[PDB]
Symmetry: C4
Subunit: 362 residues, 4 copies
C-alpha cells in the first residue's frame, strides 16, 4: 500500500513548502547591496523600479496609498468595495497628482490599478474604469480556475486589450496558471488562503503552501513570459526575497502596509498605543452569510516611504548574499529546506530584546 | 537496517496523517457554492440531504437533538446510557414528531438511529428498539475488530436485516473494515481515539490518525458499496470537507453540537459566559474502573440550525473550490501535505481579532 | 552528496523515534481486557506478575517502596547512594517482611534487587549484598559500553552467577546490547538520556530516542533470550504498552512512582497542593563537578497500589485492543508513525477539563 | 515533477539540520572523562588546550576577556568597532600581561587575535595590528564568498602570511569553503545566521542550518588540513560536542561569554536580578540603515573560569560517552536524527525544577 494510506499514489499529490520551511543559500557574489537592481516586470509591458504592489483591500489601498506606492516605485490597486463612480473618481485623483523612482506612463503620469469582479455589473465597472484612464485591471477572484473568471479575462483581453493589462485572479496550481495563460492574461496572481486575515484554509480546508504554489505557477507561466505575482502571507523582507527567488516577479503586500498612515481609516488608541483596522474583503463587515475572513487591528507604523525603504534594503541584502545583479538572477537562486528547530534558530533566541530594530519586531 | 530501528520493515507499518496535515487542492470548477448538492448515503439504503450525524453520547443526542438534526437534513443517534424502556420511549417520541430538507421514512415520519452494545442484554435492547420503530442500529463499541462485535452484527443483520440497517463499530484499519463488510455491515464507522474527549491514545497508546484511517477503510469498503462514516476529531467545516474528500460519505459530530441549545444539559455560567457540559462515554462519570475519557465544558453556541448552516456553507464552499457538483465527485479530490509552518500559515496570523466571526473563533 | 550534508551516508546513522512518535495499531482480537495475562520475564529466571520495576534512586526506592512493589506484583531496586551497611540492612528488612500477586522466591520471601557501581569498592558492596540475601544485582551505570562495566559484569557472573542474576547497565545501541549479552548479563537495561530529570542529552549531547533504542537492543538480545528493561521517559500507561510492544520485557519507572506515599522523603505543602522531592542520581545534590541531572518536585499521588492498578489497567486495555493474550504476543504488535498534529489529536483537545481523571492530568 | 514543486530537482538543494535535530550515539569506550585530551587545532599552526574562542563583538571581547580566555586555555579575538590605535593598544595590553593550560607563544607571551574588515582602511588596520604584535588576523565579514573578502585574504597572506595566521570570514556552503581554502586561508569560519542576536535569516532570508553547514565545509577543508571554526548558535556544552563531532575543530562563543564579569560593560539590576548588555555587531547602535542584529541583555553569570570549566566538563563527558581519546577521535562520532518529540524528551520534562544546576538553565 501507499505509505500514507490507501492504494492511490496520487491522492496526496505533493508535500507543500511555505516561506518558513526554506532558506536562501548564499552563492559567489560580486554585488554590493547598494548597487543591486531591484527592477522587475509587473506585467508583460509594465516594469516597476520596486517590485511591490499594494493589496486591493478597503483598508489598505485608496487614492493616497496608490499615489504613495506609485511615487515609491511600485503600484497601488484600488479596491472594488466602492460604487463605480467613486472608484473612477479615485482613479482620476491618482492620475491627476523627491521621488526619482516614481512609476510613470508615456504621458508622464503616475500609474494606477483597479480591481473588478466577474459579471455584467463588473463589466460595466471595468468599462467605466478603463474610460477613466486606468492602466491595469485585476480580475480579483478567490478561485480563478472557475470558467466564469476565465471567460471574463478573455472578454477583457478581447475588448480593452490594446489599452490596459489584464491580470488574472488567484491560483495555486500549475493547471490553473496554464488555463489563465491560455485565456490571455498578462499576469498571474498566486495564493489561496495564505493571507494573514484569511480563514479559507480553515472554513473550507482548501489551499496550498505559498512557495510550492509559486514554483508550480512559474513552471506553468515562464515559457510564455507571463509574470507571477505572489499575493498573501508575506510578513518580513526575507519573505519577499524568498518569494522572488522561488520564481515570482512581483509581490503584493497586505498587513505590512495596512498600519501605515497612507492606508485609509482612523487611528485607534488602545492602552496608550496606536493601531488601525485591518480586515479581509471576505470578512462579514466588508461583505455587508459564510465569511472567509476576519476583522482585526494592526499596530501603527508611519509613513509608507520608510517601510518600503526597509523592505527594499532587506531585498538588496538578499541579492548581495545570493550574488544577484538583477531580479532575473535572483530567480535562479537555490533553497535549503529546514526543520522547526532550524526555524527557531533563524529568529533571535535566548535574548531579551530591550530596543526595537527598524526592520524587525517579535 | 531499517532507518527507524530493528530488522523488521513492517514493525512501523505506515506514517499516518490527520486533518491538520493535509489541505484540499483547488481544481477546475464550474460549480457555484449555492447550487452544489450535499446529499450523501448514510447507509446502503438511507440517503441524507446534509451528511452530518449526531454522536451517540449522553451529553449530545437525545429526543430534542434527534428531532432537530433530522429536521436540519441529517440524523441523530440516541445514546444507550439509558434503561431500555427509556430509550424506546425516546425513539417513539422522535417518531411522533418550515423544514424542506428534513429526512423522513416512507411513512413520512422523521428518521432516527439508536446505539446498542454487545451481549444478550444488548440483544434484548436491540429487539425492543426495533419493535419501537427505529430505522438504523449502531453497534457502538470502541473496538469493532473484536469477535463479539462481528458476531453481534451478523446476528442483527440475520434477524432484522430486512427492516433496519446495521452500522458496525469503530475501526481504524483496512482489515477491520473488511471484516465488518464480510460480517454484513450496511455502513462502517471509522475512528479509534481521535475524539476531543478521548484518552485512549494516551491511556492505552492505541489509535490511528483519522485521514489515514479513512483512506484505509475506504480502500476496503468502496468495492462493496458500503459507506464509511468519519467519527471524531472534527472541529471545523474544512475538516468535514477533508473527511468527505478522503472517501467518507458522512461525518459524525461531537463537541461541535455539544454546545448547541438542543443538546441535553443545563447551562453553566462561568465569569459571565455560557458553557455546557461535555464528557466522553468512557469517562469515569459516564461509565458509572479504568476510564478512557474525560469530563469538560464547551462554550454555548445557540440554535442547532445556525451551526448546521455554517458547516454546510463551509462544505459548499469547498465543493465550489474543488469543482465537485456532488459528494461522489468530492470524494475524488486530491490532497497536499503541509508542515507545521504551513499549518500556522493556514490559520489567521499576525493580527489581533477585534470582532469574532460567525464560523471562526480562536 | 548526502542530503543532510557531507559525503558519508553513515554519518547520520538513523532517524530516532520516541514514545510520542508512534501509536499501536488495533488488530483482530478475542481478548477481554480482564482475561489478559500481564506476566513477563524480568531476567532469564525471574518472572513477574506485573512487569513493572522501581528505579534505583534515593527519592524513589527504599525498603517500604521495595516491599510495596513486591506486594503489587513487580519489584523494587534499592539505590546505592547509602553506605554499604545501610543498603545491606535495607535488603535484610525487605527479606524479613491481602497481596495475591506478591512476587516471592522459593522460601516465600519477597524478591528485591540492589544496585552496585564499578570498582573494587563496588565489588565489596556487591559481595555484602549477596551475603544479605539479595536476589538480583543491577550494574547501575550511565554508559554500559565502557570496558569497566563489561569487565565487572563478567566478574560478578563468574563469582555469584548461580546464586543471583546480574543486570547490565544502560545501553542505547545494538552493539552495546550485544556486548552486554556476550559478557553474560541476564538482562539488559535500555535508555541513555530520556529520564524526566536527566540533562545528559543537553549537557553532553549524547543519547538515543527510546523506541529506536529498544528496537535495536531487542534485535541483539532476543536471539539469545535475554530480557530487555525499558528505563526512563515513561509518563503514561500507553507509554508502557508501547515499550512492551517495541520488544522490551519490563519497564523501570521513575517519576511515576516518586509521588506515591511509599517513596522516601517528606511531603511538601505549597498553596494547598501536595508535592514531594524528585531528583536524579547525577544531580549536584545527589552526587555530593559537572552534574547530569536536576532537582525538582512532583505532585503527590497517594498509595502505590492505586497507581499500579491504573497502569496495569491501561496495559490490559492495550492488550485487548491489539489482541494479545500474553506479553509475548504483545511484543509483536505493529506501530504507526504520527506527526505533531497527530500528537495533539491523541490528547484531549478543544476542551476545558472540569473533573480530574484517575489516570490523566494535563 | 518534484514533490516540493516545479521541474527542477535542484531548486531545494538539501535538507539542513541544526544542533537541536541530532544526538551523539554512544559507542564502545575505554576513556575516562577526566583523562580525555581536549586539545585541538585553531589554525594550521596554533593549537589550543581548550578548543574555545571568544567572539569579536563590542560587548564580548576586550583586553580583559582576551587575557582571561588565553589563561583559561582558549583565545580571544578583539572586536574592530574601535579606533585602530585603540585596538593596537588593546593588543599590546594583552601581550604585556594556576593557569597550567594557558596558551602562549614561543616567547611565553599570551596569544591573542584581532578582527579586520575589507578595504584599504582595513589594510591599514591590519598592518598596524601586525606591527603591534597580533598572533592571528580574522577577516571578519558576513558573506565570505564575496570577491573582495577573498582578495583581502589573499593580500594578507601574501604580505604577512609568514608572521600571522589569516582566518577567513563566515561561510555556509562547500563551494565558499573551497574558495576560501584556495585563496590561502589558514582557517575557515562557518555560520551565517545562527547567532542568538542575528536577524539575517529574517531580514534577508539567507542562511543554512549549522550542522549541515559544518559538514559541508569540512567536506572541503579536511582534505587540505584546514581547520573549521563553528561560530554562532551554541547554547549548551552538548552543542559544542555536536559541532566538534560534525567536523569542526573549535567553537567561537557569543552569548555564552557575554554575561560573565570579564566581558566589557556594566552590571544592570532589574527586579533584584543581574543582567548585562549584549548586542549584535550589525545592530543599529553597533553600526552607528538596514541592521541585521538586535540589542538586548543576558543574565549575569560570573567569572569566566567557572563557565569554561563547566563547558569543558560537558565536552569531556561527551568524549567519554563516545569513546574518543582525542578531539580527532571525536570528529568521527555518528549522529542520530530526532524529531520534535525527541527534543522534548532530551530536555527535562514533567518536572518543576526548584534549584538551578551549574550547567543547565530552564
Ligand atoms: N471511538 C473510540 O475510540 C472510543 C474509545 C473509548 C470509548 N468510546 C465510547 O465509549 C463507550 C463504551 O465503549 P466500549 O467499547 O468500552 O464499551 P463496552 O465496555 O460496552 O464494550 C463493548 C464491547 O466492545 C469490545 N471492546 C471494547 N473495548 C475493547 C478493548 N479494549 N479490547 C477488546 N475488546 C474491546 C468488547 O467486545 C466489548 O464486549 C461507547 O459509547 C464508545 O463509543 C469510544
Ligand atoms: N485569495 C483568497 O484565497 C481569497 C479568499 C476569500 C476572499 N478573497 C477576497 O475576497 C473578495 C471577494 O472574493 P470572492 O471570490 O468571494 O468574490 P465574488 O463573489 O466576486 O467571486 C468572484 C468569482 O470567483 C469565483 N469563486 C469564488 N469563490 C468560489 C468558490 N467557493 N467556488 C467556486 N468559484 C468561486 C466565481 O467564479 C465567482 O464568480 C476578493 O477581494 C478576494 O480577493 C480572497
Ligand atoms: N541512565 C542514565 O542515562 C544516567 C545518566 C546519568 C546518571 N545516571 C545515574 O547516576 C548515577 C551515577 O552515574 P554514573 O554511571 O555516571 O556514575 P559512576 O561514577 O558510578 O560511573 C560508573 C561507571 O560508568 C561508566 N561511565 C559513566 N559515565 C561515563 C562517561 N561519560 N564516559 C565513560 N564511561 C562512563 C564508567 O565506566 C564508570 O566507572 C547512577 O545511579 C546512574 O544510574 C544515569
Ligand atoms: N556571520 C553573519 O551571518 C553576520 C551577519 C551580519 C553581521 N555580521 C557581523 O557584523 C559585522 C559586519 O558585517 P559585514 O560583513 O556586513 O561587515 P562590512 O560591512 O564591513 O562588510 C565587509 C565585507 O563583507 C562582504 N559582505 C557583507 N555583507 C554582504 C552582503 N550582504 N552581500 C555581499 N557581500 C557582503 C563584502 O565583501 C564587504 O566588503 C561583522 O562583525 C560580522 O561578523 C555577521
Ligand atoms: C482571505 N484572503 C483575503 C481576504 N481579503 C483579501 N485577501 C488576500 O490577502 C492578501 C493580503 O494578505 P496579507 O498576508 O495580509 O498580505 C490580499 O492581497 C488578498 O489576495 C479574505 O477575506 N480572505
Ligand atoms: C474516546 N472517544 C469517545 C468517548 N466517548 C465517545 N467517543 C467518541 O468520540 C466521538 C466524538 O468526538 P468529537 O471529537 O468530540 O467530535 C464520538 O462520536 C465517539 O465515537 C470516550 O470516552 N473516549
Ligand atoms: C539522567 N538519568 C538519570 C539520572 N538518575 C537516574 N536516571 C535514570 O532515569 C530513570 C528514571 O527516569 P524517569 O523518566 O523519571 O522514569 C532511572 O531509572 C535512571 O535510569 C540522572 O541524574 N540523569
Ligand atoms: C548576525 N550575526 C552576528 C552579528 N554580529 C555578530 N554575529 C555573529 O554571531 C556570533 C554570535 O553567536 P551567538 O549565538 O551569539 O553565540 C558572532 O560570533 C558573529 O559571528 C549581527 O549583527 N548579526
Ligand atoms: K538567529
Ligand atoms: K483524543
Ligand atoms: K491564513
Ligand atoms: K531528559
Amino acid at each position: 500500500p501507499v505509505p500514507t494510506g490507501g492504494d492511490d499514489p496520487t491522492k496526496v499529490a505533493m508535500l507543500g513548502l511555505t516561506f518558513d520551511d526554506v532558506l536562501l543559500l548564499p552563492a559567489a557574489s560580486d554585488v554590493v547591496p547598494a548597487t543591486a537592481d531591484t527592477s522587475s516586470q509587473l506585467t508583460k509591458r509594465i516594469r516597476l523600479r520596486v517590485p511591490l504592489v499594494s493589496s486591493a483591500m478597503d483598508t489598505v489601498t485608496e487614492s493616497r496609498m496608490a499615489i504613495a506606492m506609485a511615487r515609491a516605485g511600485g503600484m497601488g490597486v484600488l479596491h472594488r468595495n466602492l460604487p463605480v463612480a467613486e472608484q473612477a473618481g479615485q482613479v482620476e485623483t491618482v492620475k491627476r497628482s523627491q521621488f526619482p523612482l516614481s512609476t510613470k506612463d508615456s504621458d508622464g503620469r503616475l500609474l494606477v490599478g483597479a480591481a473588478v469582479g466577474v459579471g455584467d455589473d463588473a463589466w460595466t465597472r471595468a468599462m467605466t474604469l478603463v474610460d477613466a484612464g486606468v492602466d491595469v485591471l485585476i480580475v480579483d477572484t478567490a478561485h480563478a480556475h472557475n470558467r466564469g473568471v476565465l471567460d471574463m479575462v478573455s472578454r477583457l483581453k478581447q475588448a480593452v486589450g490594446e489599452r490596459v493589462d489584464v491580470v488574472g485572479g488567484n491560483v495555486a496550481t500549475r493547471a490553473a496558471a496554464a488555463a489563465l495563460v491560455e485565456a490571455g492574461a498578462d499576469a498571474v496572481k498566486v495564493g489561496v488562503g495564505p493571507g494573514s486575515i484569511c480563514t479559507t484554509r480553515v472554513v473550507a480546508g482548501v489551499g496550498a503552501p505559498q512557495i510550492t504554489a509559486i514554483l508550480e505557477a512559474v513552471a506553468a507561466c515562464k515559457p510564455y513570459g507571463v509574470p507571477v505575482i505572489a499575493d498573501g502571507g508575506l510578513q518580513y523582507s526575507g519573505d519577499i526575497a524568498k518569494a522572488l527567488a522561488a520564481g515570482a516577479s512581483t509581490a503584493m503586500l497586505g498587513s505590512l502596509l495596512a498600519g501605515t498612515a497612507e492606508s485609509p481609516g482612523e487611528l485607534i488608541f488602545v492602552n496608550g498605543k496606536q493601531f488601525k483596522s485591518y480586515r479581509g474583503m471576505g470578512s462579514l463587515g466588508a461583505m455587508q452569510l459564510v465569511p472567509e475572513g476576519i476583522e482585526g487591528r494592526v499596530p501603527f507604523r508611519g509613513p509608507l516611504g520608510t517601510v518600503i525603504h526597509q523592505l527594499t534594503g532587506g531585498l538588496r541584502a538578499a541579492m548581495g548574499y545570493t550574488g544577484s545583479a538583477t531580479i532575473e538572477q535572483l530567480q535562479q537562486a537555490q533553497f535549503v529546506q529546514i526543520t522547526a528547530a532550524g526555524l527557531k534558530e533563524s529568529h533571535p533566541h535566548d535574548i531579551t530584546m530591550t530596543v526595537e530594530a527598524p526592520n524587525y519586531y517579535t
